[PDB]
Amino acid sequence: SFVEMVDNLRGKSGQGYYVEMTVGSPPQTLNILVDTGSSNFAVGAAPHPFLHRYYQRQLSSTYRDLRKGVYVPYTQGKWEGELGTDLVSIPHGPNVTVRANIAAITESDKFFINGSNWEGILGLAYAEIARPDDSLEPFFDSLVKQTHVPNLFSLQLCGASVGGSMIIGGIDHSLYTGSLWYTPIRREWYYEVIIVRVEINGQDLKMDCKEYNYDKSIVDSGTTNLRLPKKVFEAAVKSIKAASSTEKFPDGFWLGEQLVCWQAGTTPWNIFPVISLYLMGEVTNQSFRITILPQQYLRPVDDCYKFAISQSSTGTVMGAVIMEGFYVVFDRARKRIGFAVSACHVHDEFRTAAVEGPFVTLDMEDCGYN
Numbered sequence: 001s002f003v004e005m006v007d008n009l010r011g012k013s014g015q016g017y018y019v020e021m022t023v024g025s026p027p028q029t030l031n032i033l034v035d036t037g038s039s040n041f042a043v044g045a046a047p048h049p050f051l052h053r054y055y056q057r058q059l060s061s062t063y064r065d066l067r068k069g070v071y072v073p074y075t076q077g078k079w080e081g082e083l084g085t086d087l088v089s090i091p092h093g094p095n096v097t098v099r100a101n102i103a104a105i106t107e108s109d110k111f112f113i114n115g116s117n118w119e120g121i122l123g124l125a126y127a128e129i130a131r132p133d134d135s136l137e138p139f140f141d142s143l144v145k146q147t148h149v150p151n152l153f154s155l156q157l158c159g160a161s162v163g164g165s166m167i168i169g170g171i172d173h174s175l176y177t178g179s180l181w182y183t184p185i186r187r188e189w190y191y192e193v194i195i196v197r198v199e200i201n202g203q204d205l206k207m208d209c210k211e212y213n214y215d216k217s218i219v220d221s222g223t224t225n226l227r228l229p230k231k232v233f234e235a236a237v238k239s240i241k242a243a244s245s246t247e248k249f250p251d252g253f254w255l256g257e258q259l260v261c262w263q264a265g266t267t268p269w270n271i272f273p274v275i276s277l278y279l280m281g282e283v284t285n286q287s288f289r290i291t292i293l294p295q296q297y298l299r300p301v302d303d304c305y306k307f308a309i310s311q312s313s314t315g316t317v318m319g320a321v322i323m324e325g326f327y328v329v330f331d332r333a334r335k336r337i338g339f340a341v342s343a344c345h346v347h348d349e350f351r352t353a354a355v356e357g358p359f360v361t362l363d364m365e366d367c368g369y370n
């Protein structure tokens with residue numbers, strides 16, 4: 001049913017992926033960044049030098065003021081504004097119209113990005129993390145309640161400027177090859193999962209697995225990098241350095257401070273290691289792994305790249321670095337996230353991104369922090 005949604009996503013580099021939407025009556029058109037790591041629907045609603053277009057409440061006859069402000073701070077950027085509801089559609093989405101909560105963004109800081117082509121943000125996670133609180137129903141919850149759209153969506157982010165698909169209401173077999181493998185959502189707030197082992201070039205990092213999920217581990221289409229807790233990050237960087245020691249790089253590279261260059265075509269991919277995350281599976285003592293290549297974690301901007309693994313103090317964030325290799329299925333109805341090899345992933349002639357299992361892992365519940 002879903003060819004109509006294929007290729008409904010666009011963007012630039014590490015400036016997020018966006019889908020076209022309409023708000024209000026008559027329909028105003030905006031591009032909205034798709035964000036599995038938050039839960040507020042919000043839109044530019046006033047002049048800003050990075051916005052070429054914005055939402056104008058005056059001239060929608062279906063607007064309703066809710067007379068309540070709201071504030072949202074992210075790992076990067078923050079904004080405040082004014083709540084209301086309005087009628088909203090997704091043109092290359094399902095043929096439906098819904099009445100959703102919408103934040104009209106009045107002030108903001110280091111949120112909007114110059115030349116980005118998007119004007120708001122569609123928070124696809126659960127109510128538990130909506131500002132101002134619980135009770136502001138997120139967009140997808142309204143969609144599901146107000147229509148007959150099944151309670152799942154799936155994302156295929158291609159890292160080629162950049163493109164992909166958001167299939168709302170199901171799964172499209174043309175976007176992946178191999179099998180889908182599934183991990184439980186641990187709790188409905190973020191799309192929280194449990195990582196149970198980490199390998200770099202087939203070698204185990206040998207930490208207490210609690211450290212991998214310290215605070216929490218989440219899947220987040222609105223974050224660029226693979227972000228890793230302090231302890232895990234360093235250990236990761238040590239192993240990555242050693243396997244690539246055949247050449248040396250500035251300390252500022254490993255910190256994302258720098259950038260690193262080679263003769264167009266000549267990038268020494270092979271000297272760089274494969275990274276595997278093992279995730280909790282669906283059956284007793286059962287896990288599977290996702291493997292990424294350096295083409296995913298060295299992101300391009302002589303051909304030059306930035307190291308897109310970085311430190312975090314709020315847990316693991318599996319952003320675009322992770323997602324670009326896979327088709328990712330957010331199966332809210334069964335509380336699980338599926339991974340499969342994406343049909344648009346960047347091939348090495350020697351190696352591939354992979355989703356593999358089953359494997360056996362004991363005490364998987366114990367890997368989650370409390």
Ligand SMILES: O=C(N[C@@H](Cc1ccccc1)[C@H](O)CNCc1cccc(C(F)(F)F)c1)c1cc(N2CCCC2=O)c(=O)n(C2CCCC2)c1
Pocket residue numbers: 014015016033035037038039072073074075076077110111112121129130220222223224225227310319
């Ligand atoms: O924090 C970021 N993403 C937000 C959403 C967002 C989109 C566009 C601009 C700014 C922010 C995600 O929502 C983060 N989810 C985790 C989260 C942390 C804190 C609070 C919340 C919540 F729920 F309250 F919103 C959620 C973030 C974080 C980024 N960073 C900073 C260090 C490495 C990295 O990937 C980043 O590069 N981006 C890029 C800018 C455009 C999108 C990719 C974004």
